[PDB]
Scaffold this motif. Structure first.
Motif, PDB file in Angstrom:
ATOM      1  N   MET C   1      -8.776 -59.877  83.518  1.00 33.76           N
ATOM      2  CA  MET C   1      -7.809 -61.028  83.429  1.00 33.76           C
ATOM      3  C   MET C   1      -6.398 -60.483  83.204  1.00 33.76           C
ATOM      4  O   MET C   1      -6.191 -59.315  83.086  1.00 33.76           O
ATOM      5  CB  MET C   1      -8.227 -61.810  82.133  1.00 33.76           C
ATOM      6  CG  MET C   1      -9.641 -62.377  82.092  1.00 33.76           C
ATOM      7  SD  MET C   1      -9.881 -63.680  83.285  1.00 33.76           S
ATOM      8  CE  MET C   1     -11.653 -63.701  83.069  1.00 33.76           C
ATOM      9  N   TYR C  29     -12.596 -60.946  75.828  1.00 29.74           N
ATOM     10  CA  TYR C  29     -12.192 -62.195  76.432  1.00 29.74           C
ATOM     11  C   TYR C  29     -12.685 -62.300  77.896  1.00 29.74           C
ATOM     12  O   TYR C  29     -13.086 -63.388  78.351  1.00 29.74           O
ATOM     13  CB  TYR C  29     -10.649 -62.425  76.426  1.00 29.74           C
ATOM     14  CG  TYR C  29     -10.233 -63.807  77.010  1.00 29.74           C
ATOM     15  CD1 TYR C  29     -10.735 -65.013  76.472  1.00 29.74           C
ATOM     16  CD2 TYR C  29      -9.550 -63.896  78.226  1.00 29.74           C
ATOM     17  CE1 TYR C  29     -10.596 -66.230  77.052  1.00 29.74           C
ATOM     18  CE2 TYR C  29      -9.381 -65.180  78.867  1.00 29.74           C
ATOM     19  CZ  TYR C  29      -9.864 -66.379  78.228  1.00 29.74           C
ATOM     20  OH  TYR C  29      -9.693 -67.636  78.874  1.00 29.74           O
ATOM     21  N   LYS C  31     -15.168 -60.960  79.670  1.00 33.46           N
ATOM     22  CA  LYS C  31     -16.620 -61.083  79.731  1.00 33.46           C
ATOM     23  C   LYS C  31     -17.137 -62.454  79.496  1.00 33.46           C
ATOM     24  O   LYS C  31     -18.200 -62.755  79.969  1.00 33.46           O
ATOM     25  CB  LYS C  31     -17.333 -60.112  78.728  1.00 33.46           C
ATOM     26  CG  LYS C  31     -17.150 -58.631  79.182  1.00 33.46           C
ATOM     27  CD  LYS C  31     -17.781 -57.533  78.246  1.00 33.46           C
ATOM     28  CE  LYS C  31     -17.227 -56.214  78.601  1.00 33.46           C
ATOM     29  NZ  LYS C  31     -18.046 -55.099  78.252  1.00 33.46           N
ATOM     30  N   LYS C  32     -16.400 -63.230  78.714  1.00 28.87           N
ATOM     31  CA  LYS C  32     -16.731 -64.554  78.230  1.00 28.87           C
ATOM     32  C   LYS C  32     -17.548 -64.410  77.043  1.00 28.87           C
ATOM     33  O   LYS C  32     -18.491 -65.164  76.797  1.00 28.87           O
ATOM     34  CB  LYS C  32     -17.351 -65.539  79.284  1.00 28.87           C
ATOM     35  CG  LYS C  32     -16.561 -65.710  80.570  1.00 28.87           C
ATOM     36  CD  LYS C  32     -15.173 -66.323  80.381  1.00 28.87           C
ATOM     37  CE  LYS C  32     -15.090 -67.844  80.507  1.00 28.87           C
ATOM     38  NZ  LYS C  32     -13.643 -68.227  80.601  1.00 28.87           N
ATOM     39  N   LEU C  33     -17.184 -63.398  76.312  1.00 28.62           N
ATOM     40  CA  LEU C  33     -17.759 -63.172  75.037  1.00 28.62           C
ATOM     41  C   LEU C  33     -16.682 -63.545  73.985  1.00 28.62           C
ATOM     42  O   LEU C  33     -16.113 -62.693  73.276  1.00 28.62           O
ATOM     43  CB  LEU C  33     -18.273 -61.672  74.839  1.00 28.62           C
ATOM     44  CG  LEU C  33     -19.491 -61.382  75.642  1.00 28.62           C
ATOM     45  CD1 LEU C  33     -19.693 -59.856  75.909  1.00 28.62           C
ATOM     46  CD2 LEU C  33     -20.712 -61.890  74.880  1.00 28.62           C
ATOM     47  N   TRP C  34     -16.552 -64.898  73.876  1.00 26.40           N
ATOM     48  CA  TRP C  34     -15.687 -65.588  72.945  1.00 26.40           C
ATOM     49  C   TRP C  34     -16.081 -65.477  71.486  1.00 26.40           C
ATOM     50  O   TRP C  34     -15.192 -65.398  70.666  1.00 26.40           O
ATOM     51  CB  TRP C  34     -15.562 -67.080  73.266  1.00 26.40           C
ATOM     52  CG  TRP C  34     -14.969 -67.502  74.630  1.00 26.40           C
ATOM     53  CD1 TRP C  34     -14.689 -66.694  75.692  1.00 26.40           C
ATOM     54  CD2 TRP C  34     -14.924 -68.851  75.114  1.00 26.40           C
ATOM     55  NE1 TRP C  34     -14.274 -67.460  76.816  1.00 26.40           N
ATOM     56  CE2 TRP C  34     -14.483 -68.763  76.469  1.00 26.40           C
ATOM     57  CE3 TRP C  34     -15.243 -70.134  74.549  1.00 26.40           C
ATOM     58  CZ2 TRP C  34     -14.193 -69.954  77.144  1.00 26.40           C
ATOM     59  CZ3 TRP C  34     -15.041 -71.280  75.360  1.00 26.40           C
ATOM     60  CH2 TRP C  34     -14.569 -71.141  76.625  1.00 26.40           C
ATOM     61  N   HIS C  35     -17.375 -65.402  71.104  1.00 28.41           N
ATOM     62  CA  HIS C  35     -17.888 -65.214  69.824  1.00 28.41           C
ATOM     63  C   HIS C  35     -17.466 -63.810  69.429  1.00 28.41           C
ATOM     64  O   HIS C  35     -16.915 -63.617  68.339  1.00 28.41           O
ATOM     65  CB  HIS C  35     -19.469 -65.194  69.827  1.00 28.41           C
ATOM     66  CG  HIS C  35     -20.278 -64.578  68.737  1.00 28.41           C
ATOM     67  ND1 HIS C  35     -19.985 -64.675  67.424  1.00 28.41           N
ATOM     68  CD2 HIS C  35     -21.383 -63.783  68.812  1.00 28.41           C
ATOM     69  CE1 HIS C  35     -20.971 -63.964  66.743  1.00 28.41           C
ATOM     70  NE2 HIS C  35     -21.807 -63.337  67.558  1.00 28.41           N
ATOM     71  N   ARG C  70     -10.913 -71.753  73.793  1.00 26.18           N
ATOM     72  CA  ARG C  70     -11.400 -70.479  74.210  1.00 26.18           C
ATOM     73  C   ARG C  70     -11.911 -69.764  73.062  1.00 26.18           C
ATOM     74  O   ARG C  70     -13.027 -69.279  72.944  1.00 26.18           O
ATOM     75  CB  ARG C  70     -10.320 -69.709  75.018  1.00 26.18           C
ATOM     76  CG  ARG C  70     -10.088 -70.058  76.558  1.00 26.18           C
ATOM     77  CD  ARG C  70      -9.965 -71.597  76.838  1.00 26.18           C
ATOM     78  NE  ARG C  70      -8.665 -72.062  76.289  1.00 26.18           N
ATOM     79  CZ  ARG C  70      -8.140 -73.347  76.215  1.00 26.18           C
ATOM     80  NH1 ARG C  70      -8.936 -74.388  76.677  1.00 26.18           N
ATOM     81  NH2 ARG C  70      -6.858 -73.671  75.968  1.00 26.18           N
TER      82      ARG C  70
END
Lengths: 195, 62, 376, 134
Positions: C1, C29, C31-35, C70
């Motif tokens: 990104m 961020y 990866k979509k590993l927001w946790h 997000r």
């Protein structure tokens, strides 16, 4: 599913905060639960569905009802800082059997495991053996536990499954993006008997 | 609503806006499920009202 | 990104060997590993030397603006607080704190944190009036939830700081009390607590009609806190708590180290005695409640003529209620004011309850024994 | 038939007796009615455990009030609690009539009888609950 009363478990975990299931897994679970209600009714219409949160000092959100509207009202409040306690939810389904609507129906729990198990493995393998005699089996939907470690949950289901007249299964949906729709894979159509 | 302002340019990147679009697709479908719940709440309140209405109806006539 | 990675690369480039920490945030961020992203930011802002600099301020601004769902505002809010202490310019800072306060993921408590933080910033700058209005609003919001432990306590410390700046000690002591109930050491810096506790200790003594010494013994914030000056000062609070004129007054030499105590030394000795009327009557006699004047007189080492007048002030404050009979040389208490838990007190209550149990059992036998025909 | 219809000496518990007196009293002259939950043993012993009430109206007892929907609805609640009760009979209150069974009250009793063969009909006097004789 078919003359079965089921308690559905939604996860509370830190792992729900992920973007893997869009937008967030917490909100996604709402879509998922309505899929589980709709699937069970589709197969035969003679079953009931419930919803439990394992958030805080474990509260029954809503008990057995055929109504999807009741479950959905209760799911929006959830503890996104909580954590899944697999062991306690089973206990809530046990209490439910004595006094529920559909007293004479069969016993099943369908559980989401969206995060690793918290309650000690040994305690749970052993718990399964007691459960087989009363005739309630647990079907585990696994995508949270698998990433970190090997499926502990597999052991639980194996011992559990005997004669009950209801079976159990370990269904795996992938840990990555698959949205709520993945719930189709579950024993909400893939279920079998024990007898 | 929020977008298509000049202020948005300053605050955020372009990449934030496209990613927000991807999240939106899933968000709408969920809102459609929520339609079924709202109708369901409206009927429960009404039922209490329906009980009440039976009594009002007779007194009103002769 | 090139969402948060674009600003982050600029920042990453300039730090030394801190670059590696920066790179983690950018992947998590994407990866979509927001946790994983939520935890990452909290560890991250501590380590870089670049952080104190302007690049970080700008970075948090882009971070929050871009993320309201997000990742949750609560982790970003925590980050802006660590940075806001470092800055040399509080004016600009104040403005930034407010900016971050926008939307919420689901439900996160982050709204209030920004409000408390603007209160903290106001106080340093020298805008006292402003500090005050915001302090009043947050105080309700925090109070309502059982879940707020820590946040409510920092806010409470903040209101005590405003009272102290004026230099009006009576007002300061009272406000400080709300902090003593809310106290917890966790998420409350060791240093703010330390300064406040020493000042407070002095403050209560200076007061004309405030008494909560017993409360002070109970909390570790004033009690465990010790310094050279502090050893004598706690012994003076203890003397007060028990209600002994004589212990208090013997300590007088030490007081002089603080001139504050020295100016109103006169007021301080009279006050102990005023307390004694209340303290002596509840503690030592079960059977009586009357006190002679002469007792006060010797204790205080203050003349007889004054004590009669001091006793009159005592009644007017409402430490004691009763009448004074001059010709019998007694002040009789019909009533004694409630007092916050004291060391002497707890012991007397038990003793009196024991006397009471025993009498009620003896008496029960008499009442039952006689009048046989109606007793069924 | 004379060959199987015998009277039902009713054992009325505190929960039923109090409920019926209160409900009639507040409604007056609007009359209240309902189904009675209890158990049936012997060929003549009915214990009236508890009651719930049907719709009040300003004409009182009528055919319109009695619907199978209310009853059917209740029975679903009985399952959910795990209470077993079958329907023993029905009740009504007459402030606006005497103890005699009004012309609408007999109609209502006939429907209720089709559902439970052993059915009882109770007149309550809410007005008398104010005085010390009931």
């Amino acid at each position: 599913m078919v003359l079965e009363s089921t308690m559905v478990c939604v996860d509370n975990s830190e792992y729900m905060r992920n973007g893997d299931f869009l937008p967030t897994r917490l909100q996604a679970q709402q879509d998922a639960v309505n899929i589980v209600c709709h699937s069970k009714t589709r197969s035969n219409p003679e079953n009931n569905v419930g919803l439990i949160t394992l958030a805080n000092d474990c509260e029954v959100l809503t008990t057995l009802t055929p109504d999807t509207g009741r479950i959905l009202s209760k799911l929006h409040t959830v503890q996104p800082k909580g954590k899944i306690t697999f062991c306690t939810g089973i206990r809530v389904a046990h209490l439910a059997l004595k006094h529920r609507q559909g007293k004479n129906h069969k016993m099943r729990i369908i559980a989401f495991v969206g995060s690793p198990v918290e309650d000690n493995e040994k305690d749970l393998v052993k718990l399964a053996k007691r459960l087989k005699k009363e005739k309630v089996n647990v079907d585990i939907i696994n995508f949270g536990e698998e990433e970190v470690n090997t499926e502990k949950l597999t052991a639980f289901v194996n011992t559990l499954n005997g004669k009950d007249g209801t079976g159990s299964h370990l269904v795996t949906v992938p840990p990555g993006p698959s949205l709520a729709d993945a719930l189709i894979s579950s024993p909400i159509l893939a279920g079998e008997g024990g007898a | 609503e929020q977008d298509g302002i000049g202020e948005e340019v300053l605050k955020m990147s372009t990449e934030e806006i496209v990613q927000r679009t991807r999240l939106l697709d899933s968000e709408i479908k969920i809102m459609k499920s929520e339609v079924l719940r709202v109708t369901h709440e409206l009927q429960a309140m009404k039922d209490k009202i329906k009980e009440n209405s039976e009594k009002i109806k007779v007194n009103k006539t002769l | 990104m090139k969402d948060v990675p674009a600003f982050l690369q600029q920042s990453q480039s300039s730090g030394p060997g801190q670059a590696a920490v920066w790179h983690r945030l950018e992947e998590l961020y994407t990866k979509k590993l927001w946790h994983q992203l939520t935890l990452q930011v909290l560890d991250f802002v501590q380590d870089p030397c670049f952080a104190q600099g302007d690049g970080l301020i700008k970075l948090y601004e882009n971070f929050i603006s871009e993320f309201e769902h997000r990742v949750n505002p609560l982790s970003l809010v925590e980050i802006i607080l660590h940075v806001v202490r470092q800055m040399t310019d509080p004016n600009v800072a104040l403005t930034f704190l407010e900016k971050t306060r926008e939307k919420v993921k689901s439900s996160d408590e982050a709204v209030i944190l920004c409000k408390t933080a603007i209160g903290a910033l106001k106080l340093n700058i020298g805008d006292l009036q402003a500090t005050k209005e915001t302090i009043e609003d947050v105080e309700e919001m925090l109070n309502n939830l059982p879940g707020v432990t820590s946040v409510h306590s920092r806010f409470y410390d903040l209101s005590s700081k405003y009272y102290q700046t004026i230099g009006n000690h009576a007002s300061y002591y009272k406000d400080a009390l709300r902090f003593l109930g809310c106290v917890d050491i966790k998420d409350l810096p060791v240093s703010e607590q330390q300064e406040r506790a020493f000042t407070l200790g002095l403050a209560g003594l200076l007061g004309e009609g405030v008494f909560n010494f017993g409360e002070l013994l109970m909390h570790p914030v004033l009690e465990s806190l010790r310094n050279t000056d502090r050893q004598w000062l706690i012994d003076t609070l203890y003397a007060f708590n028990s209600g002994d004129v004589d212990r208090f007054q013997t300590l007088k030499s030490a007081w002089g180290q603080q001139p504050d105590l020295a100016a109103n030394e006169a007021q301080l000795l009279r006050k102990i005695q005023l307390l004694c009327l209340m303290e002596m009557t509840f503690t030592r006699p079960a059977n009586h409640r009357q006190l002679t004047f002469e007792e006060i007189a010797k204790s205080a080492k203050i003349t007889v003529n004054k004590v009669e007048l001091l006793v009159m002030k005592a009644l007017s404050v409402g430490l004691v209620r009763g009448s004074i009979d001059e010709v019998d040389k007694r002040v009789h208490m019909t009533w004694v004011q409630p007092r916050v838990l004291d060391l002497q007190q707890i012991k007397g209550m038990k003793d009196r309850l024991e006397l009471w149990c025993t009498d009620v059992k003896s008496m029960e036998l008499l009442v039952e024994h006689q009048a046989q025909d109606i007793l069924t | 038939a004379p060959a199987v219809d015998t009277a039902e000496q009713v054992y009325i518990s505190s929960l039923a007796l109090l409920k019926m007196l209160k409900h009639g009293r507040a409604g007056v002259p609007m009359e209240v009615m309902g189904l009675m939950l209890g158990e049936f043993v012997d060929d003549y012993t009915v214990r009236v455990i508890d009651v719930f009430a049907m719709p009040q109206s300003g004409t009182g007892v009528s055919v319109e009030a009695v619907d199978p929907v209310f009853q059917a609805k209740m029975l679903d609640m009985l399952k959910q609690t795990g209470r077993p009760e079958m329907v023993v009979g029905w009740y009504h209150s007459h402030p606006g009539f005497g103890c005699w069974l009004s012309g609408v009250d007999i109609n209502t009793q006939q429907s209720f009888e089709a559902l439970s063969e052993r059915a009882v009909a109770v007149v309550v006097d809410p007005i008398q609950s104010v005085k010390g004789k009931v």
